[PDB]
Ligand binder design. Structure first.
Ligand SMILES: CCC[C@@H](CCO)COc1cccc([C@H](O)CCN)c1
Ligand SMILES: CCC[C@@H](CCO)COc1cccc([C@H](O)CCN)c1
Ligand SMILES: CCCCCCCCCCCCCCCC(=O)O
Ligand SMILES: CCCCCCCCCCCCCCCC(=O)O
Ligand SMILES: [Fe+2]
Ligand SMILES: [Fe+2]
Ligand code: NA
Ligand code: NA
Lengths: 506, 506
């Protein structure tokens, strides 16, 4: 984890304030020691332009995509940023108004390609994304925009999430609504022929939908060597309002009675498994990690307890209020909670009415009912009052899809990011890093090249630190063992909020 | 909290072995120093005779009631015990066989009054009880049996729990099935006329039942200055099989679809409040404490996650198995979990779809649905794998029904009691006391008489220690602050399992 800090000075407003791009990199002023093995680029996306002249964007996910880069070499750091030249951005600069409708901002007189959320590798290319059918190829060294790619030209999905899984050979998996099913897309690694791997995309498996005409909102999914896990939540997209001045936010509604349905598919045999896993209602944005343990799937999730859509609390006008009002507005919101679910793969009918989770080191349960639903209860890993452990990250390259111990997160305090967190998912111990009037971003883990343990490395986070007598922002490097500060690299300009990113080793 | 000990020597079997009563008190040999302010009697009930000749009792709750007493005066301790002369016991000694059917043992050729569970004060009298219509007046100084009282002679209930609440003026509240509703019985304090307060008992309020013909099993309930809280679980008593060689165990079944329904009544206005609180399925035996905080009831519970009846795992044949087998048999049982539920008393229709729990210090939620059900999620206070925090006790005289911080419990390890626990319900910190091959009982808290703080006192537990090179049993006194040992008083005979009891100050 929880925060130990209030924010009466209101400096978090700087997360939502327009900035200018740079024509070339700035030096960042280092205190402490940037690790000498840290060589590469931290790339992150977020909104950077929150109005077009006098026409405002309304929602957190509406501002125009800005691509950020911190470069690390021989203990020195540079910072650079450029707006992504999407259709939405280019046409707004051309027409000097809002041209394309964004998530929560209707344009007055066409799907947005405003790639403000994340960036990921496919073959030798990098793509910025949002959650629509459009992803944007970008140059990871210059930050120039290369092209728009319409996924519908290649595979049958209406969009895809900003959280594809990336196997170590470069294979990319993602999930998207299909207008009704949810399809898993597979993009292969770059082959010797050197054709764009996107032209070899295919649907490998399909998940069913709980409601013929109302697909659930899907933000992420789970992946192991052998299974795919999809969590169908009660936040629904109303297709009647969707396909007919509305925005994307206007199409969401909450199904009160379904709870949460969980789904697994066999990855290698490409087959849906008809096990009716059921539990109580929550919103889910981020899976933490998933893995197999004696024919149970361990599913670690960042949950929000309730069926109301958490995105209702993320209009900019609400996030820009003073601190007492931010706290008040969050009082009726779903409560965040880190939960471990355990999914049995071997359902014996003779165990009807009993708990199937026979593993020795969990309190998660799964009860086989007579109608063949399997009712699940979680083991709670972390819970604090309006204190979200969010934007989770792990040592992904070595522990993604595998038994693991540690997650890192951004701690939200009534939605305001104000700390960095580490959770031991076996012992439930936590570690916190936090300073007054400091607003971090998602932490990204980078392994030490000679690592023996899971947490032998660092996390990188971009921190907004307003108020005079500090420079406006900095790159923070924490030791992953205990979250103690190893270095920071201060820059002389503001940085707005960023969502997701990656570290590109060079 | 969890246990750090295995039990391969199997000494826990001594909890379930017949003992002989004493004709008068033994000296208990003190090591350490019994506090000189500790003056009174620890009175406890449990089974003491587990067969009648060659006819065995089968279930944990079948053995013949044995009343135990440890006396404390001027740093010296005595131990004494006598079988309660119930109908079941007297008629078994007379006929030299099992005459009355017990909970899980059918008698071959009449409701049991085998008061093996608890003892409580009414007026100037003490009653041993089970959960039927019969309670047994006993002498707290000599342990003689005085008389049988049939509650049906006085009030309209078919039985009453072994966990009545006792207000500071001596008023006694209890709950019982009525054959369908659940009735709250009120027994007044002793008045100046000095008539038996049981003759002035009355039903003050009635709770509805979820199923016209199947009442829920009820073990305890919650009480605050202003409210009564009743938790209706999915463990049902099948009245068709009940009123028709069956035993009590044969009448239980699990409702798979209802989950848990929670109910509140206004204590002072004697009125049921029609708020449809709902959550997922669990067994509940023991409420920990209940209290009011602004317009919310805080309901702390010892839960078992699942709808299968936990009593199925408590046949003596299963509890007498070797350790590897005990662990295996408990693998499919419901998982124990301490949970805090928060119940809103102010339901505004305008908050439909939202979380009503606006308190600042909890992650529990309550969601108002369109059908007017209020779906609840708990804040988990403690959770360990088959590690139950059970038989909870608090500083009841000063904090029962009130805001509080500390609970004490008996820790079960795959159902085997092997440790004592303390839980801070605000911070979730725990403390443990445990020794190898030592099987404690429910801890009872006794305040220093001049205490101003909540945990300024001791806990007492009866410990069975069958390891050779130790005496067979002892009374344990721990400091309530940190569960460090203050003293123990060893006795030279075995003591079987005991369930509940009290400390009678003198
Ligand atoms: C009606 C919702 C449609 C789904 C796509 C399914 O085809 C999501 O659509 C958008 C559109 C614009 C911005 C976003 C943002 O990425 C969200 C926040 N991460 C999502
Ligand atoms: C079919 C169940 C009936 C209910 C009474 C409802 O009027 C409970 O009945 C017994 C009978 C015998 C021993 C017990 C034990 O006290 C239980 C565990 N404490 C309970
Ligand atoms: C750094 C962000 C701070 C302000 C917004 C935080 C509220 C987050 C709520 C949970 C996660 C929602 C998903 C957002 C990330 C994404 O678009 O992928
Ligand atoms: C000291 C008891 C140890 C062996 C039995 C432990 C199993 C307890 C399961 C949950 C509590 C069940 C209710 C027992 C107390 C009572 O009858 O009031
Ligand atoms: Fe995300
Ligand atoms: Fe009990
Ligand atoms: Na600090
Ligand atoms: Na010990």
């Amino acid at each position: 984890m929880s925060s130990q800090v209030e924010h009466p000075a209101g400096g978090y407003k700087k997360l939502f304030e327009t900035v200018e791009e740079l024509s070339s990199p700035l030096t960042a002023h280092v205190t402490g020691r940037i690790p000498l093995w840290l060589t590469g680029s931290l790339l992150r996306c977020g909104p950077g332009l929150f109005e077009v002249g006098s026409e405002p964007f309304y929602h957190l996910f509406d501002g125009q995509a800005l691509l950020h880069k911190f470069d690390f070499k021989e203990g020195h750091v540079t910072y650079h940023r450029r707006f992504i030249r999407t259709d939405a951005y280019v046409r707004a600069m051309t027409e000097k108004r809002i041209v394309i409708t964004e998530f929560g901002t209707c344009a007055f007189p066409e799907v947005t390609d405003n790639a403000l959320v994340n960036i990921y590798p496919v073959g030798e290319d990098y793509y910025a994304c949002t959650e629509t059918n459009f992803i944007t190829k970008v140059n990871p060294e210059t930050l120039e925009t290369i092209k728009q790619v319409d996924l519908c030209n290649y595979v049958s999905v209406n969009g895809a999430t900003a959280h594809p899984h990336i196997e170590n050979d470069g294979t990319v998996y993602n999930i998207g609504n299909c207008f009704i099913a949810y399809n898993i897309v597979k993009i292969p690694p770059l082959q010797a022929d050197k054709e764009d791997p996107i032209s070899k995309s295919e649907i490998v498996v399909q998940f069913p939908c709980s409601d013929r005409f109302k697909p659930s909102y899907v933000h992420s999914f789970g992946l192991t060597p052998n299974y795919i896990v999809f969590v169908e939540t009660p936040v629904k997209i109303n297709l009647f309002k969707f396909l007919s001045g509305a925005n994307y936010m206007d199409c969401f509604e909450s199904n009160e009675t379904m709870g949460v349905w969980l789904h697994i598919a066999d990855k290698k045999r490409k087959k849906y498994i008809n096990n009716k896993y059921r539990t109580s209602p929550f919103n889910l944005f981020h899976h933490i990690n998933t893995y197999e343990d004696h024919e149970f799937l361990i599913v670690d999730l960042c949950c929000w307890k309730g069926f109301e859509f958490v995105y209702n609390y993320l209009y900019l006008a609400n996030l820009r209020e003073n601190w007492e009002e931010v706290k008040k507005n969050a009082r009726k919101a779903p409560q965040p909670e880190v939960r471990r679910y355990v999914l049995p793969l071997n359902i014996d009918k003779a165990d009807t009415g009993k708990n199937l989770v026979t593993l020795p080191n969990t309190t998660a349960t799964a009860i086989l009912c007579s109608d063949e639903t399997i009712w699940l209860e979680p083991e709670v890993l972390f819970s604090g009052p309006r204190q979200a452990f969010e934007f989770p990250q792990i040592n992904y390259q070595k522990y993604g899809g595998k038994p693991y111990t540690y997650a890192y997160g951004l701690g939200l305090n009534h939605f305001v990011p104000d700390r960095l967190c580490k959770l031991n998912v076996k012992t439930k111990e936590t570690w916190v890093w936090q300073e007054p009037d400091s607003y971090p971003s998602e932490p990204i883990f980078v392994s030490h090249p000679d690592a023996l343990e899971e947490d032998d490395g660092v996390v990188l986070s971009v921190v907004v630190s307003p108020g005079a007598g500090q420079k406006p922002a900095y790159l923070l490097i924490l030791n992953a063992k205990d979250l103690s500060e190893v270095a920071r690299a201060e820059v002389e300009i503001n940085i707005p909020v960023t969502f997701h990113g990656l570290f590109k080793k060079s």
